Design a protein around this ligand. Structure first.
Ligand code: CA
Ligand code: CA
Ligand code: NA
Ligand code: NA
Ligand code: NA
Lengths: 104, 103, 104, 103
């Protein structure tokens, strides 16, 4: 049990230290920026209430997927297709990072 | 095929070997903890039966996605958003582990 | 253009050669076995038409997600939760493999 | 922050550098090809407008998932199942690439 906590602590330190790498920071900011753009687009173009635009943006960008909503306009549909690849590009970025930071 | 059988067993041994690594155990406990918290949160704030709160918690945390349900309250939606990122955080954790154990 | 095809060919050979690794074979068989069990369970317990039980099994095991259907019984719900982790375990398996076969 | 700006630019350079690797180009062409085929298949067999066939093709091939639609015909369902595995096959491809370029 004490080992659990010590391991947990060492791992948490390593996670917080990751928030120090400038490339991880960029990816993070880019992600926030992407989530904000999505929130703006869906509230504007699809008329979704702000909190629902972020929710759709989050579930869509993370590949979780929305359970009922889907863009109603052709403009929304196109944006979403593009939004999704941006999301995949970001994930690969993080993955590429975790791939380099491990092989150094 | 004995050959096939032997390969499976070797793999299974390597799997159970991971369930011994402390870091993997932490990650595992944390996801169960996360699943429980989720099950609790959705039972309370969204008022789902426990089994349906666990289900939504699972399909949501793993990025599988629910086919019909989605948080009705603002609290539920905000929680779900953070929940998903915890899930991503956890998966990166397991992945980093799998990329550290290869070396 | 000729390079495209040559690269494409070399990559395809490498993919087919992967179908030779006994561990990849096991993971593959395990996956088929898992998809068959799912197809049987959902058709039986949830009364889904066979082709729909496989479809749900596939979209669920791959994290794609079903757009409308979800287990109606508590038995189905429990099985699905477990089904999902089996699926994640298999994915990590493949990933672990692609991680070793690259660092040899 | 110039520092932040410089980091971004370095990363962007490394991204465009990948769009030069032949193997990555193949993988990319193959997914576009796959997306087109999907868009075509769902337009015909399921009778969706092209933009809705592309959308379902995308959300399906990336594992994001559609919130309401799903193939109505048996042909559509069988195709979708194989489509998803092509998608998994493609992602493993990009991943293997990202794990070969690290070394
Ligand atoms: Ca999904
Ligand atoms: Ca739905
Ligand atoms: Na997913
Ligand atoms: Na995924
Ligand atoms: Na869904």
């Amino acid at each position: 049990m004490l080992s659990f906590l010590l391991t947990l602590k060492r791992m948490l330190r390593a996670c917080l230290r990751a928030w120090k790498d400038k490339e991880f920071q960029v990816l993070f900011v880019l992600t926030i920026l992407t989530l904000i753009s999505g929130t703006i687009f869906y509230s504007t173009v699809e008329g979704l209430r702000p909190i629902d635009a972020l929710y759709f943006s989050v579930v869509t960008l993370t590949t979780v997927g929305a359970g009922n909503f889907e863009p109603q306009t052709d403009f929304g549909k196109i944006f979403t297709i593009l939004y999704i690849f941006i999301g995949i590009g970001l994930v690969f970025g993080f993955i590429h990072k975790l791939a380099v930071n491990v092989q150094l």
